[PDB]
């Protein structure tokens, strides 16, 4: 079935948890398998609303792509980023949802900040959510995203058994 | 079964184990499973009584988090870190136990000094275990805790099987 | 049976592909097994025909030892590499066939090229693929081969299970 | 049954391969299991005898323990080892057997000089093996030890499955 193991970060404005989510295969007629849909290291923000209190029911989500988990491991105590997602980009509702998630460094070099934008041009709504990460977190996060990426690729299924 | 394997580490004052202790899910009704107890790495510190002679009972353990796993991996030469655990902290016998965790340098670049103190008000008990971890001792330690990292946090179970 | 999951870099003038090629072994009389023919990490390079559209049937292949691999994944910002093969080294053929693979740096430090060239003696044709590899795209690269090396060495049958 | 995937390194004197040799355990009564012996990375060094034809039965031996491929794998461009033992350290044969595998690098970068001396004072033997090693070439063994470090530590038994 499926698994449940979020790693979770929570601060007084807002949560973030991230998870693998694997890929999935077609098996082939001819014998074994293809990959068909693609892994990504799912993101999932959240509100505080009452000290360590947050609403589930406004989360907005984030999917990583194996690429984008590229960029965040060998981010740099200095370096920043900025990811653009749009869910309907080749669909018809393209232009009405756009995603938005940036990692900042502080000043000091003691952590990051991390922040999701969604913009809902269809709803007529504004979100953005944003957590600080410490350099411990963050080294979490670049560890398990680090040892997740073989998975999300489907390159764990290439083992001599 | 249960697993034991500790990496260990004993010199003249103290000895010093590290040991990772899995998380443990609840298997749900919809089906698949969600973490439920948290993984740790478990040190385990107790006494010289006696060249190459340690004891046992006098032992006392320290369960690192994930984040302070992530905190240590991520240590330079120069770096230093201390933690604090109250056992208790949520129950009622809140501030009878205080257990502190160190990792220091040393000077040269040779190592570092990692010491645990537990201060116990209840039984009016103090005991600190101090044990010296050369660079490879911790170079072993970081690369064992990074590889142990994701299976405490229960990411193994993201496996294409 | 068998598995396809290759990691893939698309650009302007070609593309790219990897994928892992485990070794085989042959179960010894005695009992258990010996790495018979080597584990390669396997590119496949093709040629763009108009936007996003490549041409399948003019693929090149080149076939990474895990001496090349090791040379990509410590291969700094700074850093080249070239790899020459004749696939027919040791035959009656040798000299007909040369491939090239060159990992070039590009003045910024924002990525690389990597180039595949192939010369035929025998069918007289001279073809040449470059595919631009950005920091984070290489990192994904260097992180699955990194995985990788392992299990194209054998060294995954090394579990305690 | 046994498994055998060796790296190995041919050079103009000598030649050296490398193997994971997995710690063994004993299932407790009480269920699960405790690790016994310890599993090491062996090294097998043995001479040239003529262009790439090599003398196995001149073989020599070196059992690294998980610190040494600690102390390995955080060895700097410019770093140097030694490692010395006794096979019979704690028996009555102490002292007549004693071996020694030295890492340097060399001026250049370019990589290093391992030398494997067995002196033997029973058989009144003195042997010495050396093998230069590139960067790409140590880049596999540090990152191939790295993967194994966990494993011959029997870290790797601590999965939920």
Not at 20 to 30: C, H, I
Not at 117 to 141: C, G, W
């Amino acid at each position: 079935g499926r698994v449940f193991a979020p790693y979770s970060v929570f601060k007084g404005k807002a949560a973030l948890s991230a998870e693998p989510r694997l890929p999935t295969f077609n098996r082939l007629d001819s014998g074994g398998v293809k990959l068909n849909r693609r892994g990504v290291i799912m993101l999932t923000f959240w509100p505080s609303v009452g000290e360590r209190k947050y609403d589930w029911e406004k989360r907005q989500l984030f999917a990583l792509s194996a690429t984008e988990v590229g960029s965040l491991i060998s981010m740099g105590t200095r370096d920043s980023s900025e990811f653009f997602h749009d869910p309907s980009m080749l669909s018809s509702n393209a232009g009405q949802v756009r995603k938005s998630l940036s990692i900042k460094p502080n000043a000091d070099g003691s952590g990051y900040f991390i922040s999701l934008s969604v913009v809902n041009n269809n709803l007529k709504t504004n979100d953005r959510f944003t957590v600080p990460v410490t350099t411990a977190e963050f080294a979490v996060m670049r560890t398990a995203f680090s040892f997740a990426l073989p998975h999300i690729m489907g390159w764990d299924r290439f083992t001599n058994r």
